[PDB]
Design an enzyme around this catalytic site. Structure first.
Site, PDB file in Angstrom:
ATOM      1  CG  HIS A   1      -1.613  -1.254   1.424  1.00 48.06           C
ATOM      2  ND1 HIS A   1      -0.992  -2.368   1.947  1.00 48.06           N
ATOM      3  CD2 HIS A   1      -2.887  -1.619   1.138  1.00 48.06           C
ATOM      4  CE1 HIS A   1      -1.845  -3.369   1.961  1.00 48.06           C
ATOM      5  NE2 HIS A   1      -3.002  -2.946   1.479  1.00 48.06           N
TER       6      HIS A   1
ATOM      7  CE  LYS B   1      -4.652  -5.947  -0.279  1.00 51.30           C
ATOM      8  NZ  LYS B   1      -4.973  -4.761   0.544  1.00 51.30           N
TER       9      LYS B   1
END
Ligand SMILES: *C[C@@]1(O)C[C@@H](C(=O)O)C[C@@H](O)[C@@H]1O
Ligand SMILES: *C[C@@]1(O)C[C@@H](C(=O)O)C[C@@H](O)[C@@H]1O
Ligand SMILES: [Li+]
EC number: 4.2.1.10
Lengths: 237, 237
Positions: B132, B159
């Site tokens: 992230h 991800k």
């Protein structure tokens, strides 16, 4: 960007009560009604004016756009170039028209296109200058150059519709319209056709485009969805 | 691609019956329940197991993912790296967990990460390796290299969640995930955060991504929408 929803119709000369009922059922979703006319063999401005009169009660809910899409740009219209351009020019004389589509392609007579566009604008018509490739999606730089050539006519809208072969082609179309939107004065409209391109239609406003086209009955182009569902989508972004 | 819809929750140590009722009311929209745990200061495997029992997850309803999001990747978790990694490893011992998130970043001990991931996989846990950036969206090539480094661990999912500041950043995230999906073996998930990035969440499957995250109550990350509306969106593409 607040995107306007365009409903595409394609009636024959006599617009049927059943179509009028379908439009009314979708009235809150329709910002612009696009009357396609290329499917009317040997269509005249007189016939177009007659059709427009029948759609004059809901005049207060939407703008009227008239589009003659030529066969070579993926429509039905078989007019030669001169008859086509004479039609486009004559549409200026119909009071109930608000917007007119005129096609761009590399072989156009520039000064003539500009004379016509000036003429339509003198008659208070918004001009959508449009280009379609039903076969493929040119590379990013080419899509940008097409946008560049079309905007030199100072239309109200430039519209580019292309057919993706893959995901990168979809992203290229979105990038072209996004870069145009951020840098240039006139409104832009990008369409990546087919189911693969549907996101260009639903998230058009995210990328700075001004119009998105949907249908009333069957899809009038690959990837179109019903305008009621289209309006709901546009409202989410 | 059929996208699985993840519902993010972030309860205190005692999960209230009201939350459980909200989840059950959205059961058809939830493919994965993401139990965030970083909001529980000094959380232990025992406390996580207690919360999981309190959810009373029914057979064949959704997979359970447990995520401890560290403060430096935009969560609440204040654990030092060793305590964090010891937590991740201990999660393997909880039968009711199906999936576990582990974070990637440049400074990881690679061989240790690989030991833990192998360990989780020996315990029949699906591993989501995640990264992230809440500040910005790196350039395309950097997004790709991040995906490259994460996939070397042979996780079940890679991800990448990034924060757009313009349209090109959103398109870059979509391009990175699309190119990964076309070329690599493991599942990929991409998130462009915030309202500007919402299209990454709703059209995730268009670009080949495997999961999309939404909420029950308030958004648990910028741009999330309710999982019921998220499921309906995914179904449109
Ligand atoms: C502008 C245009 O060619 C776009 C089509 C579409 O792909 O939605 C519909 C046509 O009616 C329209 O003129
Ligand atoms: C994967 C993840 O960091 C993505 C967040 C989002 O942007 O929706 C939600 C988090 O809970 C999740 O772990
Ligand atoms: Li959508």
């Amino acid at each position: 960007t607040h995107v306007e929803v365009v409903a595409t119709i394609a009636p024959q000369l006599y617009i049927e009560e059943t179509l009028i009922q379908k439009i009314n059922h979708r009235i809150d979703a329709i910002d612009v009604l696009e009357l396609r006319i290329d499917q009317i063999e040997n269509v005249t401005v007189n016939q177009v004016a007659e059709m427009i009169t029948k759609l004059k009660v809901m005049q207060d809910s939407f703008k009227l756009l008239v589009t003659y899409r030529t066969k070579l740009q993926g429509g039905y219209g078989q007019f030669t170039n001169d008859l086509y351009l004479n039609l486009i020019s004559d549409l200026a004389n119909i009071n109930g028209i608000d917007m007119i589509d005129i096609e761009w392609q590399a072989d156009i007579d520039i000064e003539k296109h500009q004379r016509i566009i000036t003429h339509l604008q003198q008659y208070n018509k918004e001009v959508v200058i449009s280009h379609h490739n039903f076969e493929s999606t040119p590379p990013l730089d080419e899509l940008q150059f097409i946008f560049f050539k079309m905007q030199k006519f100072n239309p109200e809208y430039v519209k580019l519709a292309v057919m993706p072969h893959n995901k990168n082609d979809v992203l290229n179309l979105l990038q072209a319209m996004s870069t145009f939107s951020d840098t240039m004065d006139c409104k832009v409209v990008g369409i990546s056709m087919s189911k693969l391109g549907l996101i260009s239609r639903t998230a058009q406003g995210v990328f700075g485009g001004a119009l998105t086209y949907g249908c009333i009955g069957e899809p009038q182009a690959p990837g179109q969805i019903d305008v009621t569902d289209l309006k709901a989508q546009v409202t989410l972004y």
